Structure formats: C-alpha cells, structure tokens
C-alpha cells in the first residue's frame, strides 16, 4: 500500500477545456540539493557597483521552494494560442499541488570514486505557509519555476530573504527579524509517502485580453457637431470669441474621460534606429528614493505604452525583457537585441500614453494686457478623477500573480510586472532534506557539524482551474490572431533543437481580439 | 392581425455558438422582376465560339428562385474565422426559410413620366419543390445567391433549364421534356401573407477542415529498419540480389496506402513566372466526351493539388477562380491575376498528387538476357484499392452543396467544385408575380397578352443549423491561424469602400488546423 515498491502518484499533464472553465495539469521532476550543509547563514552586502541600494542584510536557509508562478509552467504554446485567440479574459479559480515518488540519494567520495546510493530510511520535510508569516519571495520575478517544457528536470531554488539593514550598509537594525523555518509544523516524508495541498483563489477581476478598437479621445460621433462651444480667440479689444465644435474635429471636442497616469522614460531605437554612441545609461534612468538610497524601477507603473505601433523606438525601462534561453547564475555577459525577447505594449496605445513623450501642457502664468498667455509641458502626471488605462499585458513567459504588501494602505493593487495582485496568494511550499549525522563516537555539547551528504528527487503535479470570459462581438471583418508564421524556418519554434535544447524565439501576449470602448 | 399595416416578419440576422451546434440566421431584401412578360419561351442555341458543346435546347420561365447555396450567404467573415481556426469539421443539420413583408409595385409609363404605385390587391406565388420533379439548377455554381453583405438588395434569377437536343444542334429530341411550373400547387400571397418552410439535411460526412501533418509515404518510423527486403540488382550472372530497407529511407520502403486518382493538367506560372507568349489555350485544355461533343471540365475530379506549396505554378484548370467583385451579365472583358481570387489546394499536398506532373511510371516490357528493363510515365491514374485522398476544400465564396444526379449508379458522390453531395438537397423555392390583365373590352379565344407591368419585393430569412467537430490535439507548438494581416492597408478588407462597395481581397478556405495521418 505505502512502501518502497509502490508508486505514490501518477503523471498528470493535460488540459481540459469545458465551457467557461479550463483545468491545466502539469507534472515535473525536481531535484533538491542540501543547501548550506544544513546551516542557517547570515548573508549581507555593502554598496556594490557604485550603488548603496545594493546593500542588504538577510539570511539564507537550508530549505528550498516550489515556484508555480510563470504561465508556461501551466500552459502549452498551443493551449495559450487557443486561449488568447478565442477569449476576452481569464482568472484563476483554484489550485492543488501534490508531491510524490520521493527518492533520497546518499553520495560518498573515496579517492574520487564518487558513488551514489539511495537511502530508503531517509526523510524529506515539507510545509506550506498558510498564514503568510514568512517573507514571501515568490512573486518577484526570479528564477526557479517549473520548466516550460515537461521533459526538463529542474533544481529547486534556495530560500532566503533580506530584512532591514542600517544606514544603507550591511549591518542590521533592531527591527531586523530572523525567521526559523524549523519552527513551523511540517510533514516528514519517506519514499512511500506523498504530500497534497489545495487552495482557492480569492475573487479578482479578469485579466482583460483584448485591444481597444477606438481611440479614447475619438469616442464622439464624426457625423454630428457638438452643442458645446470653445474659446477660440480675442478681438482687437480684449473681448473673447467662441466657435462651435464641429463634427469630426477631435482636437477641439469636449472629453468625459482622460488617459491614465504617466512618467517619462527615455526612448531607444531598436533595429535600424541610430541611437547614440557609448552611453553608460545608469545615471539617466528613472529612479525612486527610499531610506536615502536611489533605486531603478525597471518596469514603470501601469498606464503607459512602451512602443508606439510600428516605430523602432522603445522605452526599455517600461518594457519586460526576456532571454530566448536560460542562463547560468551570475552571468555578466552583454547581450544584443537578437538574444532578447522584447515585449511591446502598443496594442494599448489608443487608451495609454507613450512613455518617451511629454504628456501634455498647462498654463504657466496669468495673462494681462501686458503679458501674453504661456504654457509648458509636463513630464509626469498621476491619477486623476475620470482616468481610464489598461494594465500590463501577461505573457506566456511572465508571472501569474503577486502578493500585495501588508501595510496600512494601497491603491489599485495591480502588479507592475503583470498578473493578479493577491492579498492571500498561493502559499509558499518549502522543502528540505532532513539531516543524517555522520559517525559520532563521543558526546559533545556543540552541535553536530558532520553529516551524510545527500540529495532528493521526485515529482510534483500542479492543477489549476481557470475561469474564462467568452468573446461576444459583432465585428463583421476578421480579426488578428496569433499565428505560427515564419519565412524559411530552419527549425520549428517552441520545440526541441537537434541537440535537445528547447527553443522559444518570440514572446506571446494575450491581446489580439479587439473590442470597442 | 394579417393586413396591409401589420408587418409579417422581423429581421433576424445573427449567429449562436452553442457547444457543437451553431445556428446562423441571415435576412436579405429581394426584388423580383416579371420575367418574359408572363410567357414561357423556348430557348435554344447552336454551336457558338467554335464548339458544338455550347448548343442546347430548353425553356425559360416567368418564375424566379431563391438560391442559398454560397457560404457567405450564411456566414460572416468573423464567424468563418472562428469556425476554421477552432474546428476539425462541420456539416449542415437543418434549414428553415421564411418569405415575408411582400410588396407588389405597379409601374406605368405615360410620355416618359414612369410613375410607380403599390398594388395592394396583387398576389405573388410561391412553391417549394419537395419531390425533386423539376430540373435542379441550384448546385451548378451560377449567380443569384443571397449577397455576402446584409445591406445589399438583390434580384432573384430567372428560372430556366436545358433539355435534350438532337445531334449537337439546337433542335429537340422526342425525349425533350417540358415542365410547366403552374402545374404544381403553390401558395398565393398578398401583402399581409407570409411563407415558411422547414428542411432536415440527410446524414452526410463532416467536411474535414484540417491539413495532414504527415506525408503519406513517410508514415514509417525513421528510427527503426523494416523487416522487409527489396530487389536491388542482379550480378554478372542473371542472379537477383536483395538489400534490407533501412530506417528513414522513404523512397525504398514498403507502403500500405497510395495517393488518390490523378489526371494531368497544364501548369501555368502566376506572378513572376515566365510562361509562354500568345497562347490561345482552348485547344490544349483537358476535355471529356459526351454524345459526340467535347467539353472542358474546369474543375478536375478530386484527388489532386493545383499548387505545390510556395511555387508560382498553378494548374488553373484544377483551380476554383473567383472575382474580387461582382460583374455585369455577359461581360466579355479580359482579367488579369490581380483582379482574380485564385485558390490553392497546397495544404493537401502530402496526401494528394500535383496536377501538372506525371503520376509515376510502370514497366513497359519483359526483360531478357537480350533486352534491358524499360519503364514509362503515365499522365493519368484512377481509383485503386487502398487509395486515400482529400476532397476539394470549401471557401467562404463557394458552394455549400450539390445534388447527386439521378441515374443507376455513382461512385463517391463528392462534388468537384466543393461541399456536400446530397441525394435530396434543399428543395428549390420558386416565385413569380401573378399576372394582372390590362383593359380588355371584348371576348377573344386567344389568350390575354396585355398585362399591367409590375414587380415585387420583400424579405427572406434563412436559418441553418450546423454540427461541429471539436479539435482534439496533442500538438505542442502553435498552429497556423487565419489572421487579418496587411502591410500598409489603404482600406479594411471585408468592409464597404468610401463609395459603399463591399470589398473582399482574398479567398478564405477551411484548412488551417493540422492533424497527423
């Protein structure tokens, strides 16, 4: 029933499209190193690369964690296409995770033989953090998620966190906190044991995957004039003059609604664009301040568009930039446009303001008979009553959710990188190898530092349920679809290479179907 | 309830996607001329344009008919896209037609005033031919269908047919038959009256809209060898030698299945292809014989592909060729490639043989010590046991169904032009204006030849139900979709022009999703 020669799970990887629901099942194989050699280590940094915003104080743990938070973990490229071409929206309903077929392997080294055997009596520890009492590291856009491609085996990331540091240095504060993860009740698993967990997502709005089919400022009827008048000019006396707003003149018409917030970020020309030679580009990025340090915010807040339709100019600090292939840890290499997957928000340009331009102008003075009217442009503007914008699009390579920070107050909790802001997101699932001491022949009151070196492996299946929003549209002519289109392909995209390396050439977002404002 | 000031129907134009069903409703406005001036006229022709296959004998009638038989009558360009991108097949389940809001208009001419008034007492006659007793003219690819675009008003075609003629001349036979359409019971309708009809399609196979994802002859595993051997050669003595069939050598492997039938038609190079100058091209087309005359068959039989993938060469006598815009009756103008919508069957090239090449070769002799083996190519081959092919694709601009001719025998009744072969297709719905005599002050035994000139108009709604075949596929990577893609468009396609003229630039077929053999 439960033992060494009986499998504790099966491989469920599949998708089931039923009505407005869809359930996606994905199973992967993982391997867990024994991190720190069963130690909690205090990690810290001072200012590096000329910035004291890189200073931190924190801890690294023996534990490791499961990260479900990228879309390609749950979705096939063909299932993502079926979703984005056919639907106006989706949101996650529920989640359940299972960890099974555990294998603990003891490794030994004598004169460089390095033999490996399996320890049938050894245990692994697993707990889920249901009450959100640990620092939540998942939604921050870091590596270690289940692979995009099911055959791939992956290592679990090491768990660690940064607490408060003092005066932008590597030293701690009195409010720097240490969290022991052994002080949670956890479940201990041998080979025949398995683990199961179930979670229900809180109510969130649908991700709206459509593009606006109208301009925000062109919403008026082009055939009929307005009954509203505008101040046109003033005669040779100071007397003021008025004209009627006519038909399709959209510069002059009255508006109910206004674009979303903005801040200006530098545009850079990809491809044939000429740009400028030998820029260092760190000093001129947009920044914010905390605690006397200056941080780059590489996504900006929502309400802008990084690219304007078919132009070469991108903001690059308003963009999500991906690599076409995974990289080694700590790679300082320089990459070009061809190596990069550079997303475009230009499907939102009707309702959103371009990031590399000014946002408008306002009056800078009071006129008189003596002085003429004057204006000036503004490079930043924030939330205004009657504003409408679109949120950052979601990509198959991008994050599903984020956790809203726990403080007093927040506004419109939509993550800048993308996805769903969640007060109670899917909990963190943490796992470690239980230590097995080496040969100890004596009593000592100092803790045991000599352990059998070992690692564990197994399978994990995740099952998510998604709610779908049907596309109900009276558009007569055909729409834009995500299609598989390449001229003289030397390989097929989203498939293994001749070596076995899985290749993804281009990013895929959700906004294709079009809808009127 | 039923009268002049009460509408007898409503405008239903819509589509409802429910599960595997979809119902498409479309309403149009029609106008019916009074044809022949209420006369049956015997029409005939001798050999014209140098061909006695153009000779015929037949009759034209005062009647006119409703023709539902093109796909764009029932389908929007956006609904056709949703169909062909998401589904593996469809077939019609049921049909119902309604004719309502009848208006009869009397026209009079005095000294070129040409006034028009409405005759409230005048009638229109409508019958459906349920028993298939009339010549069925609908499925033959001729004009007069409900428009593609709902705002358009259309004239009903005049009903007529050709019977037997004698010795390829304009004269009749003893088996030439005359059908009076007054000798059917029909329903007479004034302004407040309406007509309704319901029909259930007989069981037919799904139109298979997918492309094959494998080659017919490449179905073997490329990794493993066959256990079968081939005759390779013979040594210096006549002794015969054999080799094993190896792995991925698909020229040499044994086959279970064979391509469909063929006949060779001349290929012609579109676009930059050089072709040949000043060809008359009628004498060299493929033909068949009946009754001592020679007819061009401009579609060929099924089982070939007109285009080979991205080549410029087309068969043009294996192709369905459409005009991007409707034309006037009897237009002798010459058209170029740009005016034409030229379909490609190349998605069937894995399973179907190209029409402009030979189909293979066979042994032409018996060898000996004296004579060497010889072969020769064949330009035509027909149905063979174990043949597999794909049927002609259906297009939004093309016919839905055809009627299988009533004879003793037939084989595989799939129409060459496309769609569904039907023993009992949707009946013909015939309509005429009832005659109103002019002023007759005397008795004569010769029939009344003087009538009030008048026409009628109204609305017709058609409602069809379609059964759908879900696409169930394990393909990992994305597929090809029909997308709305144009570089620097000066107009939007499948929408009215600045003048109001509805524009369709390109043909749309059903085969996009891919499936393995």
Tokens of A158: 């090491």
Among A24, A481, A508, most B C-beta atoms within 10 A, so best to mutate, is A481
Report the 10 Å Cβ neighbour count for B120.
12
Alpha helices by DSSP H, listed for A272-419, are none
3-class SS at A189? strand
Asked if A190 and A123 touch (Cβ cutoff 8 Å), the reply is yes
- Alpha carbons B225 and B227: distance in angstroms, whole number: 7
Host domain of residue A191: 2-517
Which chain B residues touch A514 with a CB distance below 8 Å? none
Rg over alpha carbons for chain B, rounded to the nearest Å, is: 28
Report whether B267 contacts B313 (CB < 8 A).
Answer: yes
Residues contacting A196, CB < 8 A, separation 6+ = A96, A97, A98, A99
Residues from chain A that touch B395, judged by Cβ atoms under 8 A, are none
3-class DSSP state of B399 = strand
| Exp. method | cryo-EM
Is residue A209 within 8 A of residue A88, CB to CB? The reply is yes
User: What's the burial of B205, exposed, middle or buried (CB within 10 Å: 0-12/13-18/19+)?
Assistant: exposed
Any idea how long chain B is?
517
Q: Within the 454-493 window of chain A, which residues sit less than 8 Å (CB to CB) from chain B?
A: 473, 475-485, 492-493
**Cα B132 to chain center, whole Å?**
20
Q: Which residues of B touch A484 (CB under 8 A)?
A: 477-481
Place of tokens 């949670």: A184
Half-sphere exposure of B428 (CA within 13 A, CB side): 25
Could you give the C-alpha distances from A85 to A81, B81, B494, in angstroms and in order? 6, 11, 20
Please tell me whether residue A429 adopts helix, strand or coil conformation. strand
In a mutagenesis test of the A interface, which of B14, B88, B222, B481 is the best target, namely the one with the most A β-carbons within 10 Å? B481
Where are the extended beta strands (E) located within B129-234?
153-155, 158-163, 187-189, 195-200, 207-208, 211-212, 229-234
Contact with chain A for residue B397, Cβ under 8 A: no
**What is the spatial distance between Cα A269 and Cα A282, in angstroms, rounded to a whole number?**
17
Give all strands (DSSP E) within B405-486, no chain letters: 420-422, 429-433, 454-470
Residue A110 near residue A415, CB atoms below 8 Å = no
For residue A443, the tally of other CB atoms under 10 A from its CB is 5
Indicate the SS3 state at residue A122: coil
Between CA B417 and CA B57 the distance in angstroms is 25
Q: What gap in Å lies between CA A462 and CA A198, rounded to an integer?
A: 10
Interface of B with A in 85-124 (CB under 8 A): 85-86
CATH, residue B66: 2.170.30.10
Please give the Cα distance from A310 to A275 (Å, whole number). 17
Tell me, yes or no, if B76 comes closer than 8 A to chain A by beta carbon.
yes
Place of tokens 């069981």: B203
Q: How many CB pairs under 8 A join A and B?
A: 81
Number of C-beta neighbours around residue A115 at 10 A: 9
HSE-CB for A246 with a 13 A CA cutoff: 3
* Contact at CB, B476 and A85, closer than 8 angstroms: no
What is the experimental resolution, given in Å to one decimal place? 2.9
Question: Considering only CB atoms, which chain A residues are within 8 Å of B76?
Answer: 476
For the four alpha carbons of A163, A164, A170 and A171, in that order, the dihedral sign comes to: negative
CA dihedral defined by A375, A378, A381, A387, rounded to 10 degrees? 50
- Cα-based distances in Å from B163 to B58, B159, B292, B294: 5, 14, 17, 18
Looking at residue B48, what DSSP letter applies? B
Q: Looking at the 3D structure of chain B, how many domains does it have?
A: 1
User: A129 exposed, middle or buried (CB, 10 Å; 0-12, 13-18, 19+)?
Assistant: middle
Backbone dihedral angles phi then psi of residue B487, each to the nearest 5 degrees: -100, 115
Residue A72, H or E segment: helix A71-74
Residue with tokens 């994305």: B478
CA-based nearest residue to A209, from A396, A398, A415, A469? A469
């Amino acid at each position: 029933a439960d033992g060494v020669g009986n499998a504790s799970g099966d491989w469920h990887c599949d998708s089931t499209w039923m009505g407005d629901r869809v359930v996606t099942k994905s199973t992967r194989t993982w391997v867990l190193p024994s991190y720190n050699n069963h130690q909690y280590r205090e990690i810290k940094s001072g200012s590096v690369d000329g910035s004291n915003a890189n200073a931190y104080f924190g801890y690294s743990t023996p534990w490791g964690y499961f990260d479900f938070n990228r879309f390609h973990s749950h979705w096939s490229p063909r299932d993502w296409q079926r979703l984005i071409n056919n639907y106006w929206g989706f949101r996650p309903r529920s989640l359940r995770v299972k960890i099974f077929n555990i294998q603990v392997k003891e490794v030994t080294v004598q004169d460089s033989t390095t033999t490996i055997a399996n320890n049938l009596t050894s245990t692994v520890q697993v707990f889920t953090d249901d009450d959100y009492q640990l620092p939540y590291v998942v939604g921050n856009g870091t590596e270690g998620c289940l692979p995009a491609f099911p055959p791939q085996v992956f290592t679990l990331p090491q768990y660690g966190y940064a607490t408060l540091n003092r005066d932008n240095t590597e030293n701690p504060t009195e409010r720097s906190s240490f969290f022991c993860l052994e002080y949670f009740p956890s479940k201990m698993l041998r080979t025949g044991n398995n683990f199961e967990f179930t979670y229900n997502f809180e109510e969130v709005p649908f991700h709206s995957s459509f593009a606006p089919s109208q301009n925000l400022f062109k919403l008026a009827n082009p055939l009929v004039d307005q009954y509203l008048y505008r101040f046109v000019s003033t005669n040779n006396t100071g007397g003021v003059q008025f004209n009627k707003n006519l038909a399709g003149r959209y510069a002059n018409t009255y508006k109910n609604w206004f674009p979303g917030p903005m801040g200006r970020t530098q545009g850079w020309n990809l491809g044939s664009g000429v740009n400028r030679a030998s820029v260092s580009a760190f000093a001129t990025t947009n920044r914010m301040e905390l605690e006397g340090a200056s941080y780059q915010v590489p996504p900006q807040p929502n309400g802008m568009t990084n690219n304007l339709q078919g132009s070469n100019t991108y903001a690059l600090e308003n963009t999500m930039i991906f690599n076409s292939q995974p990289a080694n840890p700590g790679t300082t290499a320089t990459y070009l446009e061809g190596n990069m997957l550079i997303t475009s928000e230009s499907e939102t340009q009707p309702v959103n303001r371009v990031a590399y331009n000014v946002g408008g102008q306002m009056a800078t003075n009071n006129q008189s008979s003596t002085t003429a009217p004057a204006t000036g442009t503004y490079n930043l503007q924030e939330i205004v009553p009657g504003s409408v914008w679109m949120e950052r699009d979601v990509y198959l390579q991008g994050p599903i959710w984020a956790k809203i920070p726990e403080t007093g107050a927040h506004f419109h909790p939509s993550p800048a990188m993308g996805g769903f802001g969640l007060k109670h997101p899917p909990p963190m699932m943490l796992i470690k190898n239980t230590p097995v001491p080496g040969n100890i022949t004596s009593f000592s009151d100092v803790p045991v530092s000599s352990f059998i070196t070992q690692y564990s492996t197994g399978q994990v299946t995740v099952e998510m349920e998604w709610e779908l929003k049907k596309e109900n549209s009276k558009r007569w002519n055909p729409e834009i679809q995500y299609t598989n289109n390449y001229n003289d392909p030397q390989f097929v995209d989203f498939a293994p290479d001749s070596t076995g390396e899985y290749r993804t050439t281009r990013p895929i977002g959700t906004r294709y179907l079009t809808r009127p404002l």
